[PDB]
Amino acid sequence: GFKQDIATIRGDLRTYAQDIFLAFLNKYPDERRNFKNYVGKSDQELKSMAKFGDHTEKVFNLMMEVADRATDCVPLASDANTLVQMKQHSSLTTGNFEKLFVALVEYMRASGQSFDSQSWDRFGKNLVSALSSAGMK
Ligand code: HEM
Ligand SMILES: Oc1c(Cl)cc(Cl)cc1Cl
């Protein structure tokens, strides 16, 4: 289920983080334009850039912390607060996050593995509503 998926992802975090983030950028090319340094790079070129690996891993680490602190795929209000308040996130709307979760769920469904896709979809929806409640546009 959702809790095991957290353990699966954490076990090979940089690999999942990279593959899911690439899926996101490839499914929504306009989102790439928010990442100036990733414009004009293939998947394999990105996977050779230090900040790409680092940043995707740090993003997914925080995702997994929020996922683990959630109850029944409902994240803590305080965690939503953090994601809204981050300087790095002042440009964002909730649509950016919805898109990331759509790509994430589609990745999980396509994979050979027994991810609880439905729970991640619901976690995504609940996080987007929590971000809105914490004041994201
Ligand atoms: C649960 C979802 C997400 C989490 C947990 C998260 C977490 C973080 C973290 C930890 C950082 C700092 C990375 C670093 O500076 O090394 C960060 C930076 C950033 N995030 Fe996110 N993020 C999420 C979703 C998004 C989405 C959907 C976008 C855009 C479409 C976005 C755009 C950014 C940008 C532009 C930065 C730049 C900060 C920098 O230059 O260091 N994030 N995010
Ligand atoms: O370099 C970044 C990556 Cl790869 C992903 C995100 Cl969400 C943010 C930043 Cl600043």
Side-chain angles (χ1 to χ4, degrees), residues 1-86 89-124 126-136:
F2 187 76
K3 284 285 195 189
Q4 174 52 38
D5 294 345
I6 296 167
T8 295
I9 291 161
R10 278 183 166 151
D12 193 5
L13 181 70
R14 178 176 278 248
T15 302
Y16 284 114
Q18 288 183 308
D19 288 354
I20 293 163
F21 196 73
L22 290 168
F24 166 66
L25 300 176
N26 294 337
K27 185 174 180 66
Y28 300 105
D30 289 338
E31 297 298 317
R32 182 182 294 249
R33 296 175 185 269
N34 290 326
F35 304 90
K36 317 197 308 194
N37 296 149
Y38 304 156
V39 171
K41 308 296 209 296
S42 64
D43 291 357
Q44 198 55 47
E45 287 177 276
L46 288 175
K47 286 180 165 178
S48 88
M49 297 175 65
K51 281 190 168 163
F52 183 78
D54 290 349
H55 286 191
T56 64
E57 184 176 299
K58 288 177 160 85
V59 168
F60 279 72
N61 176 53
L62 179 53
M63 197 193 289
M64 296 302 103
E65 301 219 304
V66 175
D68 211 26
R69 284 191 290 266
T71 297
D72 290 355
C73 305
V74 178
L76 296 172
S78 55
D79 281 335
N81 189 47
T82 298
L83 291 172
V84 174
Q85 277 178 351
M86 275 167 67
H89 286 167
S90 52
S91 58
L92 306 189
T93 67
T94 53
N96 300 124
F97 287 78
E98 292 179 320
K99 289 169 184 79
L100 176 58
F101 281 94
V102 168
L104 180 158
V105 169
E106 166 197 284
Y107 171 91
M108 283 181 173
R109 292 186 192 165
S111 94
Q113 299 179 260
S114 291
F115 287 111
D116 184 358
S117 280
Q118 282 198 5
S119 292
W120 289 95
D121 203 352
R122 204 174 31 95
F123 174 68
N126 294 335
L127 181 61
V128 162
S129 58
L131 292 167
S132 189
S133 298
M136 186 182 295

